Amino acid sequence: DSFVIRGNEVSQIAPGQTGNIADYNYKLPDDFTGCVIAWNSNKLDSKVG
Amino acid sequence: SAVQLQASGGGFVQPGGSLRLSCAASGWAETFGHMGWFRQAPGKEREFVSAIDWWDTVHYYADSVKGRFTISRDNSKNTVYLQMNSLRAEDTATYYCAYWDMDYLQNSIPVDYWGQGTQVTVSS
């Protein structure tokens, strides 16, 4: 699975987390098995305008 | 053998909080085993927590649970509790009240019977 999150929301994206992006955008189970790959893409996903 | 276990408790604890769990015992067992919780960290493998014997003579503790975990069995209704002292904030796990049908726990890996889980998060 792939998506994009903020910088201040890095702590907000984790199993057992709460917030407008944790409880309302994507929830990870407590016994989740897998990985999370989180890298910045300022030069691609962000527009200077 | 066939043992039915009645585990209850939980809620919402805070960092530095405590729990008072319970685990009632009923049914026939090949041996008078010892009650306890056999908990995994969220996403981690199942791990031994703390042990009490049916005779109230043997107690066990672990490094990850030392100073903040205690097991005690009630003398009246025979429901073993898990008395707590200042639980840390990283115990956001599901505590399973397993059963070991052996009079002595030489190794904790083989567990004869499993119980119900107690999912408690530690946050404010």
Swiss-Prot record, chain A:
Region (Integrin-binding motif): 6-8
Source organism, top-level taxon: Viruses
Job of this protein: Attaches the virion to the cell membrane by interacting with host receptor, initiating the infection. The major receptor is host ACE2. When S2/S2' has been cleaved, binding to the receptor triggers direct fusion at the cell membrane. When S2/S2' has not been cleaved, binding to the receptor results in internalization of the virus by endocytosis using host TFRC and GRM2 and leading to fusion of the virion membrane with the host endosomal membrane. Alternatively, may use NRP1/NRP2 and integrin as entry receptors.
Subunit structure as annotated in this protein's UniProt entry: Binds to host ACE2. RBD also interacts with the N-linked glycan on 'Asn-90' of ACE2. Cleavage of S generates a polybasic C-terminal sequence on S1 that binds to host Neuropilin-1 (NRP1) and Neuropilin-2 (NRP2) receptors. Interacts with host integrin alpha-5/beta-1 (ITGA5:ITGB1) and with ACE2 in complex with integrin alpha-5/beta-1 (ITGA5:ITGB1). May interact via cytoplasmic c-terminus with M protein. May interact (via N-terminus) with host bilirubin and biliverdin, thereby preventing antibody binding to the SARS-CoV-2 spike NTD via an allosteric mechanism.
Protein name: Spike protein S1
Gene: S
